[PDB]
Design an enzyme around this catalytic site. Sequence first.
Site, PDB file in Angstrom:
ATOM      1  N   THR A 159     -43.090 -28.569  11.613  1.00  0.00           N
ATOM      2  CA  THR A 159     -44.540 -28.796  11.426  1.00  0.00           C
ATOM      3  C   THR A 159     -45.277 -27.472  11.267  1.00  0.00           C
ATOM      4  N   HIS A 265     -39.925 -40.170  14.439  1.00  0.00           N
ATOM      5  CA  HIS A 265     -39.017 -39.639  15.479  1.00  0.00           C
ATOM      6  C   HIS A 265     -38.451 -40.805  16.311  1.00  0.00           C
ATOM      7  N   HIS A 420     -36.270 -33.793  11.705  1.00  0.00           N
ATOM      8  CA  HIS A 420     -36.501 -32.982  10.475  1.00  0.00           C
ATOM      9  C   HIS A 420     -36.307 -31.529  10.903  1.00  0.00           C
ATOM     10  N   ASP A 687     -35.117  -8.139   2.885  1.00  0.00           N
ATOM     11  CA  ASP A 687     -36.580  -8.404   2.801  1.00  0.00           C
ATOM     12  C   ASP A 687     -36.913  -9.196   1.519  1.00  0.00           C
ATOM     13  N   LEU A 689     -36.574  -8.128  -1.489  1.00  0.00           N
ATOM     14  CA  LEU A 689     -37.108  -7.179  -2.488  1.00  0.00           C
ATOM     15  C   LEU A 689     -36.071  -6.110  -2.815  1.00  0.00           C
ATOM     16  N   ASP A 691     -33.943  -3.063  -3.379  1.00  0.00           N
ATOM     17  CA  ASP A 691     -33.761  -1.818  -2.594  1.00  0.00           C
ATOM     18  C   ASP A 691     -33.966  -0.580  -3.479  1.00  0.00           C
TER      19      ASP A 691
HETATM   20  C1  LIG Z   1     -44.301 -12.625   0.331  1.00  0.00           C
HETATM   21  O1  LIG Z   1     -45.678 -12.099   0.176  1.00  0.00           O
HETATM   22  C2  LIG Z   1     -46.004 -11.138   1.188  1.00  0.00           C
HETATM   23  C3  LIG Z   1     -47.522 -10.753   1.106  1.00  0.00           C
HETATM   24  O2  LIG Z   1     -47.752 -10.164  -0.175  1.00  0.00           O
HETATM   25  C4  LIG Z   1     -45.084  -9.904   1.031  1.00  0.00           C
HETATM   26  O3  LIG Z   1     -45.241  -9.195   2.288  1.00  0.00           O
HETATM   27  C5  LIG Z   1     -45.853  -7.935   2.172  1.00  0.00           C
HETATM   28  O4  LIG Z   1     -44.898  -6.978   1.693  1.00  0.00           O
HETATM   29  C6  LIG Z   1     -45.005  -5.537   1.772  1.00  0.00           C
HETATM   30  C7  LIG Z   1     -43.580  -4.774   1.903  1.00  0.00           C
HETATM   31  O5  LIG Z   1     -42.475  -5.434   2.772  1.00  0.00           O
HETATM   32  C8  LIG Z   1     -45.912  -5.133   2.977  1.00  0.00           C
HETATM   33  O6  LIG Z   1     -46.697  -3.997   2.545  1.00  0.00           O
HETATM   34  C9  LIG Z   1     -46.996  -3.013   3.617  1.00  0.00           C
HETATM   35  O7  LIG Z   1     -46.790  -3.340   5.021  1.00  0.00           O
HETATM   36  C10 LIG Z   1     -47.430  -2.420   5.960  1.00  0.00           C
HETATM   37  C11 LIG Z   1     -48.861  -2.835   6.371  1.00  0.00           C
HETATM   38  O8  LIG Z   1     -48.678  -3.868   7.354  1.00  0.00           O
HETATM   39  C12 LIG Z   1     -49.858  -4.429   7.983  1.00  0.00           C
HETATM   40  O9  LIG Z   1     -51.025  -4.670   7.123  1.00  0.00           O
HETATM   41  C13 LIG Z   1     -51.122  -5.897   6.309  1.00  0.00           C
HETATM   42  C14 LIG Z   1     -52.545  -6.050   5.678  1.00  0.00           C
HETATM   43  O10 LIG Z   1     -53.493  -6.915   6.394  1.00  0.00           O
HETATM   44  C15 LIG Z   1     -50.628  -7.168   7.091  1.00  0.00           C
HETATM   45  O11 LIG Z   1     -50.498  -8.355   6.257  1.00  0.00           O
HETATM   46  C16 LIG Z   1     -49.281  -6.940   7.800  1.00  0.00           C
HETATM   47  O12 LIG Z   1     -48.813  -8.214   8.379  1.00  0.00           O
HETATM   48  C17 LIG Z   1     -47.417  -8.143   8.899  1.00  0.00           C
HETATM   49  O13 LIG Z   1     -47.165  -7.613  10.239  1.00  0.00           O
HETATM   50  C18 LIG Z   1     -48.018  -8.238  11.218  1.00  0.00           C
HETATM   51  C19 LIG Z   1     -47.897  -7.434  12.518  1.00  0.00           C
HETATM   52  O14 LIG Z   1     -46.595  -6.806  12.590  1.00  0.00           O
HETATM   53  C20 LIG Z   1     -47.608  -9.730  11.312  1.00  0.00           C
HETATM   54  O15 LIG Z   1     -48.481 -10.533  12.112  1.00  0.00           O
HETATM   55  C21 LIG Z   1     -47.511 -10.450   9.952  1.00  0.00           C
HETATM   56  O16 LIG Z   1     -46.813 -11.719  10.170  1.00  0.00           O
HETATM   57  C22 LIG Z   1     -46.768  -9.552   8.929  1.00  0.00           C
HETATM   58  O17 LIG Z   1     -45.346  -9.458   9.294  1.00  0.00           O
HETATM   59  C23 LIG Z   1     -44.460  -9.483   8.136  1.00  0.00           C
HETATM   60  O18 LIG Z   1     -44.468  -8.232   7.345  1.00  0.00           O
HETATM   61  C24 LIG Z   1     -44.011  -7.033   8.066  1.00  0.00           C
HETATM   62  C25 LIG Z   1     -44.161  -5.699   7.266  1.00  0.00           C
HETATM   63  O19 LIG Z   1     -45.567  -5.445   7.049  1.00  0.00           O
HETATM   64  C26 LIG Z   1     -42.575  -7.300   8.575  1.00  0.00           C
HETATM   65  O20 LIG Z   1     -42.107  -6.159   9.312  1.00  0.00           O
HETATM   66  C27 LIG Z   1     -42.517  -8.640   9.393  1.00  0.00           C
HETATM   67  O21 LIG Z   1     -41.195  -9.005   9.634  1.00  0.00           O
HETATM   68  C28 LIG Z   1     -43.066  -9.866   8.640  1.00  0.00           C
HETATM   69  O22 LIG Z   1     -42.160 -10.202   7.564  1.00  0.00           O
HETATM   70  C29 LIG Z   1     -49.363  -5.691   8.738  1.00  0.00           C
HETATM   71  O23 LIG Z   1     -50.185  -5.924   9.896  1.00  0.00           O
HETATM   72  C30 LIG Z   1     -47.397  -0.980   5.421  1.00  0.00           C
HETATM   73  O24 LIG Z   1     -47.481  -0.153   6.575  1.00  0.00           O
HETATM   74  C31 LIG Z   1     -46.131  -0.737   4.548  1.00  0.00           C
HETATM   75  O25 LIG Z   1     -45.951   0.692   4.170  1.00  0.00           O
HETATM   76  C32 LIG Z   1     -44.890   1.468   4.871  1.00  0.00           C
HETATM   77  O26 LIG Z   1     -43.586   1.191   4.324  1.00  0.00           O
HETATM   78  C33 LIG Z   1     -43.285   1.820   3.033  1.00  0.00           C
HETATM   79  C34 LIG Z   1     -41.759   1.742   2.935  1.00  0.00           C
HETATM   80  O27 LIG Z   1     -41.364   0.789   1.946  1.00  0.00           O
HETATM   81  C35 LIG Z   1     -43.822   3.276   2.799  1.00  0.00           C
HETATM   82  O28 LIG Z   1     -43.957   3.641   1.413  1.00  0.00           O
HETATM   83  C36 LIG Z   1     -45.199   3.486   3.433  1.00  0.00           C
HETATM   84  O29 LIG Z   1     -45.623   4.836   3.265  1.00  0.00           O
HETATM   85  C37 LIG Z   1     -45.112   3.035   4.901  1.00  0.00           C
HETATM   86  O30 LIG Z   1     -44.074   3.880   5.542  1.00  0.00           O
HETATM   87  C38 LIG Z   1     -44.181   4.219   6.976  1.00  0.00           C
HETATM   88  O31 LIG Z   1     -43.859   3.080   7.808  1.00  0.00           O
HETATM   89  C39 LIG Z   1     -42.477   2.639   7.678  1.00  0.00           C
HETATM   90  C40 LIG Z   1     -42.213   1.215   8.241  1.00  0.00           C
HETATM   91  O32 LIG Z   1     -42.750   1.010   9.556  1.00  0.00           O
HETATM   92  C41 LIG Z   1     -41.595   3.780   8.235  1.00  0.00           C
HETATM   93  O33 LIG Z   1     -40.216   3.382   8.272  1.00  0.00           O
HETATM   94  C42 LIG Z   1     -41.798   5.068   7.375  1.00  0.00           C
HETATM   95  O34 LIG Z   1     -40.796   6.100   7.684  1.00  0.00           O
HETATM   96  C43 LIG Z   1     -43.318   5.458   7.412  1.00  0.00           C
HETATM   97  O35 LIG Z   1     -43.761   6.001   8.699  1.00  0.00           O
HETATM   98  C44 LIG Z   1     -46.221  -1.725   3.339  1.00  0.00           C
HETATM   99  O36 LIG Z   1     -47.023  -1.287   2.254  1.00  0.00           O
HETATM  100  C45 LIG Z   1     -46.916  -6.168   3.546  1.00  0.00           C
HETATM  101  O37 LIG Z   1     -47.337  -5.876   4.904  1.00  0.00           O
HETATM  102  C46 LIG Z   1     -46.376  -7.598   3.566  1.00  0.00           C
HETATM  103  N1  LIG Z   1     -47.431  -8.503   4.019  1.00  0.00           N
HETATM  104  C47 LIG Z   1     -47.203  -9.634   4.704  1.00  0.00           C
HETATM  105  C48 LIG Z   1     -48.425 -10.537   4.961  1.00  0.00           C
HETATM  106  O38 LIG Z   1     -46.109 -10.056   5.031  1.00  0.00           O
HETATM  107  C49 LIG Z   1     -43.636 -10.272   0.873  1.00  0.00           C
HETATM  108  O39 LIG Z   1     -42.811  -9.171   0.430  1.00  0.00           O
HETATM  109  C50 LIG Z   1     -43.396 -11.490  -0.059  1.00  0.00           C
HETATM  110  N2  LIG Z   1     -41.993 -11.871  -0.062  1.00  0.00           N
HETATM  111  C51 LIG Z   1     -41.228 -11.874  -1.178  1.00  0.00           C
HETATM  112  C52 LIG Z   1     -39.803 -12.223  -1.025  1.00  0.00           C
HETATM  113  O40 LIG Z   1     -41.665 -11.632  -2.314  1.00  0.00           O
HETATM  114  N1  LIG Z   2     -52.151 -24.229   9.531  1.00  0.00           N
HETATM  115  C1  LIG Z   2     -52.563 -25.064   8.924  1.00  0.00           C
HETATM  116  C2  LIG Z   2     -53.108 -26.218   8.198  1.00  0.00           C
HETATM  117  C3  LIG Z   2     -53.149 -26.161   6.788  1.00  0.00           C
HETATM  118  C4  LIG Z   2     -53.630 -27.222   6.207  1.00  0.00           C
HETATM  119 CL1  LIG Z   2     -53.662 -27.117   4.436  1.00  0.00          CL
HETATM  120  C5  LIG Z   2     -54.124 -28.400   6.868  1.00  0.00           C
HETATM  121  C6  LIG Z   2     -54.091 -28.434   8.160  1.00  0.00           C
HETATM  122  C7  LIG Z   2     -53.561 -27.353   8.883  1.00  0.00           C
HETATM  123  C8  LIG Z   2     -53.646 -27.590  10.312  1.00  0.00           C
HETATM  124  C9  LIG Z   2     -53.774 -29.127  10.353  1.00  0.00           C
HETATM  125  N2  LIG Z   2     -54.454 -29.644  11.527  1.00  0.00           N
HETATM  126  C10 LIG Z   2     -53.836 -29.839  12.669  1.00  0.00           C
HETATM  127  N3  LIG Z   2     -54.569 -30.219  13.770  1.00  0.00           N
HETATM  128  C11 LIG Z   2     -53.879 -30.404  14.908  1.00  0.00           C
HETATM  129  C12 LIG Z   2     -52.569 -30.216  14.977  1.00  0.00           C
HETATM  130  C13 LIG Z   2     -51.906 -29.811  13.836  1.00  0.00           C
HETATM  131  N4  LIG Z   2     -52.438 -29.614  12.653  1.00  0.00           N
HETATM  132  C14 LIG Z   2     -50.487 -29.640  14.127  1.00  0.00           C
HETATM  133  N5  LIG Z   2     -50.397 -29.997  15.587  1.00  0.00           N
HETATM  134  S1  LIG Z   2     -48.906 -30.046  16.427  1.00  0.00           S
HETATM  135  O1  LIG Z   2     -49.247 -29.695  17.767  1.00  0.00           O
HETATM  136  O2  LIG Z   2     -47.981 -29.087  15.840  1.00  0.00           O
HETATM  137  C15 LIG Z   2     -48.371 -31.581  16.084  1.00  0.00           C
HETATM  138  C16 LIG Z   2     -47.076 -32.163  16.816  1.00  0.00           C
HETATM  139  O3  LIG Z   2     -47.956 -32.921  17.709  1.00  0.00           O
HETATM  140  C17 LIG Z   2     -49.094 -32.777  16.837  1.00  0.00           C
HETATM  141  C18 LIG Z   2     -51.634 -30.476  16.128  1.00  0.00           C
HETATM  142  C19 LIG Z   2     -54.565 -29.462   9.087  1.00  0.00           C
HETATM  143 CA   LIG Z   3     -44.603 -32.053  11.038  1.00  0.00          CA
HETATM  144 CA   LIG Z   4     -34.673  -4.893   0.082  1.00  0.00          CA
HETATM  145 ZN   LIG Z   5     -41.740 -34.164  13.824  1.00  0.00          ZN
END
Ligand SMILES: *[C@@H]1O[C@H](CO)[C@@H](O[C@@H]2O[C@H](CO)[C@@H](O[C@H]3O[C@H](CO[C@H]4O[C@H](CO)[C@@H](O)[C@H](O[C@H]5O[C@H](CO)[C@@H](O)[C@H](O)[C@@H]5O[C@H]5O[C@H](CO)[C@@H](O)[C@H](O)[C@@H]5O)[C@@H]4O)[C@@H](O)[C@H](O[C@H]4O[C@H](CO)[C@@H](O)[C@H](O)[C@@H]4O[C@H]4O[C@H](CO)[C@@H](O)[C@H](O)[C@@H]4O)[C@@H]3O)[C@H](O)[C@H]2NC(C)=O)[C@H](O)[C@H]1NC(C)=O
Ligand SMILES: N#Cc1cc(Cl)cc2c1C[C@@H](Nc1ncc3c(n1)CN(S(=O)(=O)C1COC1)C3)C2
Ligand SMILES: [Ca+2]
Ligand SMILES: [Ca+2]
Ligand SMILES: [Zn+2]
Length: 804
Positions: A159, A265, A420, A687, A689, A691
Amino acid sequence: WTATSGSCKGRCFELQEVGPPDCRCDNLCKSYSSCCHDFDELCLKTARGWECTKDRCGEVRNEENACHCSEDCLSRGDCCTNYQVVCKGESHWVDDDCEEIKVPECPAGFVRPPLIIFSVDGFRASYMKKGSKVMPNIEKLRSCGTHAPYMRPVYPTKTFPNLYTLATGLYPESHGIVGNSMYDPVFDASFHLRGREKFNHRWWGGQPLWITATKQGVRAGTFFWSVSIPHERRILTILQWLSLPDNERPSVYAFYSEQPDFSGHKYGPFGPEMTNPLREIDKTVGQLMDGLKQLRLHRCVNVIFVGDHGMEDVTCDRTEFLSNYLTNVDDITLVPGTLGRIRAKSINNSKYDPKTIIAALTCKKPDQHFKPYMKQHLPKRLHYANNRRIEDIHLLVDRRWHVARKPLDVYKKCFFQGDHGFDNKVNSMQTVFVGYGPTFKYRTKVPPFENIELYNVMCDLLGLKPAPNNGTHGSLNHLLRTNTFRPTMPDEVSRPNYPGIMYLQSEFDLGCTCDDKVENKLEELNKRLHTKGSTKERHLLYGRPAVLYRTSYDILYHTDFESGYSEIFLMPLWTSYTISKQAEVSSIPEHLTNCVRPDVRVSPGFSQNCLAYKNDKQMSYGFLFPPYLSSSPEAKYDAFLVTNMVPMYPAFKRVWAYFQRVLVKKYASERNGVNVISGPIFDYNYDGLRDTEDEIKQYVEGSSIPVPTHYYSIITSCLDFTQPADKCDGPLSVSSFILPHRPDNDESCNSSEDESKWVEELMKMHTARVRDIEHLTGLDFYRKTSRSYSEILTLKTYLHTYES
Ligand SMILES: *[C@@H]1O[C@H](CO)[C@@H](O[C@@H]2O[C@H](CO)[C@@H](O[C@H]3O[C@H](CO[C@H]4O[C@H](CO)[C@@H](O)[C@H](O[C@H]5O[C@H](CO)[C@@H](O)[C@H](O)[C@@H]5O[C@H]5O[C@H](CO)[C@@H](O)[C@H](O)[C@@H]5O)[C@@H]4O)[C@@H](O)[C@H](O[C@H]4O[C@H](CO)[C@@H](O)[C@H](O)[C@@H]4O[C@H]4O[C@H](CO)[C@@H](O)[C@H](O)[C@@H]4O)[C@@H]3O)[C@H](O)[C@H]2NC(C)=O)[C@H](O)[C@H]1NC(C)=O
Ligand SMILES: N#Cc1cc(Cl)cc2c1C[C@@H](Nc1ncc3c(n1)CN(S(=O)(=O)C1COC1)C3)C2
Ligand SMILES: [Ca+2]
Ligand SMILES: [Ca+2]
Ligand SMILES: [Zn+2]
Ligand SMILES: [K+]
Ligand code: NA
C-alpha cells in the site's frame, strides 16, 4: 501533549493543520489522538444518515443532521448527494447518457478544472470486467472516459510504497518508502503501519503532488483520511471544500477507500464476500458524481479512479519456513510475507555471513516457492536496491506463497485468504486506471502503463511543473485531449569519430591469432563500401543512438552490423544489426574457434588483448554481433574483430550463446525480422544509472578491460508483422532485456539441463523497458523514425511481461 480543551466550531475539516499543543479539526486529527474535544459532535454528524427522503424535502435547516435537504443546502454546499434527485426531480449521474466533454463547463470563478483522485486499496485490474454488473457508476466512468486494461504498480506491491509512488512519480528506492515495514540503520529507527514513527517526515522523500501544487500557488485538499471517518463524510467534505470561495478553494483532492483490500485479505480476491465491498465502492462513486452534478461540476472536474495494487489467493498453509533451510535461524531478522528481507539480528555477531545464508537458501528443495538474491542481482526492472533501508539479502516469493522465519510466527500472530506484495509483473497484482473529464479523452482505451507515470500527468492536469521523477514526461500524452507535454529529444553530447584504416597488422601485440590468410577487384570494391557504411540503412533502422555524456567513441561499419566503439571502455556501447525472417544460422567454423582479429581502424592502445583473457582463469569472452548470423563466410571474419569482443564468464556464455544461436533466429521467424541492439551495462553501485570509469569494481585480470554487470538487447520489429522489420511504415513493437553478467547460473535451478529448458525463462525474468537501458547506458534510442516523439516515449516505457 494536546490542549484538547480548544473547539472545532467553524473549523471542521480545516485545510491547514495547527501545531501542537493546539487541538486539531483536520481529516488526520483522529490518527494523532489530537482532535478538539467537540470534533465528533461538530464535524462527524450522523443524524438522519446520508440520504434525502421525500419527507425531508424543503425541511427547516437542522444543523445536527449529517447532511441537509433544506432549500438553502445548495447555497451552503452541504446537501445530501441525492438532494436534487429526491427533491428536484433530477436523474442520478449514472442514469444519464455519456456525452463527450469537449471543453470544461465550470462555474464562474473556477481558474482551472479541479482534479479529484478516487483511490481504492487492493482493487485488482480484473474487477473492472468480473465485477462490472455490480459497479454501474465505475463502469460508466470507464466506458465514457479514458481507461487502461490495467495499470502496473511498483515493487513491492504494498500500500504505502504504491500510494507514495502515485504521489511522487518516484520508485520506492528513491522516495524511501521501500515497504509497509522498514528499518533505517542511519536513523536506527523502525517504520510500521501501527504507531507514530511513520508520521516522522524523515521517512518520506521526493516531492508529493500536494507539495508540488502548494509551492506553485495551487491549493490542495489533504490526501490522508483517518480510518474512522466514514466514506460518506469524506465525500461530503470534498464537496463542501469545492463550495469554498475562489481564493480558498483547493484545485486538487483525494478520496481514499480501504476497500476492497480489507475484505480481500479475509476472503481472497474473488470470495463471494467480495461482491458487497465492490457494490459499496460503486455507491460512493455514485455519491461523488451526483454531488458534482448538483454543484454543476460534473463536466468541469477531472476524476481519476486508481488503485494501488491487486490481490492474490494466499493461505497460511502456503508458507515456506527459513527454519527448514538455515542452521542459524536465531541469528537473522526476517521481514516476512510476500517478500523477504534478511539482515543480521545483531551487528555485534562477527560469525554472520550473507554468503552462507544465500547458499543455504539456493535451490535446496525441488519446488522451492522463493528465490534468494543479493539485492544488486534482482531484475533491474524492479528498481529495488539503491536505498539503505533495503536489506542486502532479498527473497522473491512465488505468487500464492508466503515466507516466514519459523512456524510459530504463522499461528502465534490466521484465517487470511488474500495477500499482495509480489513481483509487480504478476497478473494478480495489476490494478486499475480510469480518467474522466474535460482534459481526458472520450471513450478511449490506452495500453497498460506504470503508476510511476501518473505524477507527471496529474501535474499536466493542474498546470504544474513536476519535480524530478522516474516518469518519462510525454509517454502518457495519448491519455489527454489537451495539456499535452511536448518535450524535445535530448541533445547528443559526444559526436562519434569515423575512423578509416590507420594501423598495420604488425603494430598489434594483443596475443590474438586467427586462421584468416585467404587472398578480386569486384569484391575488393564491395569490402570497402561495407566498411564505409553502404549497408548501414539495413542494420541501423532508427538512427544511431545518441551519446548523452562526454566520451570518446568511434562508429564502425561492417557488412552485417554497425557499432559505437568506446575508446574508454575498450568495447562497444552498442551494436546494431537486422536479421530478416529469411536469415540462415551457421556454425563457427572449426578453424575460427579461437579466432580474434585486430581492427586496423582502432589503435592497439584502444583495443582489448587476448593475453588478458588467457591469464584470467575466471573470465572468457563473447561477441556482440553473433558469428552464427553472418550473411556469408566472408562477412563472418568481421564478427571475430577485437572491437566486437566483450568479457563473459563461461557460465554467462551458455546464456549468451543460446540467445545468439537459437533465440534471435526464433524472434526473426515469429516477428517477420528483428533489429537487435546489444551492449554492455556497468552498474556496480546498483543505482540504475550508467557508471563512470572510476565506479568499476572488476577488470579482466591485469588489464584496463572493465567487466560489465549486465548485457542488454533491444529487439525491435513492425507492430504490423505482415511488414518486415526493415520496411515498416507504421508503429513499432519492442521487447528488451538486461541480463545479469553472473559467474554462475545459481539463479536458474534447472541450469544443469539443456539451455532450451532454462535460458528463455531467465531472460523473461530480466525483461526490461528501453528506458531502463537508457538510464544504465546514457544512450538515447529511436532518434530517427517516422513516428511522433510521444509515441516513441510510449514505446520506450513498454515492458514485455510474458504473463498470459
Ligand atoms: C528516479 O528519479 C530520481 C529523481 O530525479 C533520481 O534520483 C536523483 O538522482 C541523483 C543521483 O543519484 C541525485 O542527485 C543528487 O543527490 C544529492 C542531493 O541530495 C539531496 O537533495 C535533493 C533535492 O531536494 C533530494 O531529493 C535528496 O533526496 C534523497 O535523500 C533524502 C535524504 O537522504 C531522502 O529522504 C530521499 O528519499 C532521497 O534518497 C534517495 O536518493 C539518495 C541520493 O540523493 C540515495 O542515497 C537514497 O538511497 C535514495 O535513493 C537529498 O536530500 C547530491 O548531493 C548529489 O551530488 C553528489 O554526488 C555526485 C557523485 O555522482 C557529485 O558529482 C557531487 O559533487 C556530490 O558529491 C559529494 O557527495 C558524494 C555522495 O555523498 C561523495 O561521495 C563525494 O565524494 C562528494 O563529497 C546528486 O546530484 C538526487 O538526489 C536523486 N533524487 C531523489 C529524489 O532520489 C533517480 O536517479 C531516478 N532513478 C532512475 C533509475 O532513473
Ligand atoms: N501518498 C499518497 C497518496 C497518493 C494519492 Cl494519488 C492518493 C492518496 C494518497 C494517500 C491516500 N489516502 C490515504 N488515507 C489514509 C490512509 C491511506 N491512504 C493509506 N492508509 S494505510 O494505513 O496504509 C491503510 C491500511 O489500512 C489503511 C490509511 C489517498
Ligand atoms: Ca494497498
Ligand atoms: Ca551506477
Ligand atoms: Zn492489503
Ligand atoms: K580466461
Ligand atoms: Na543453477
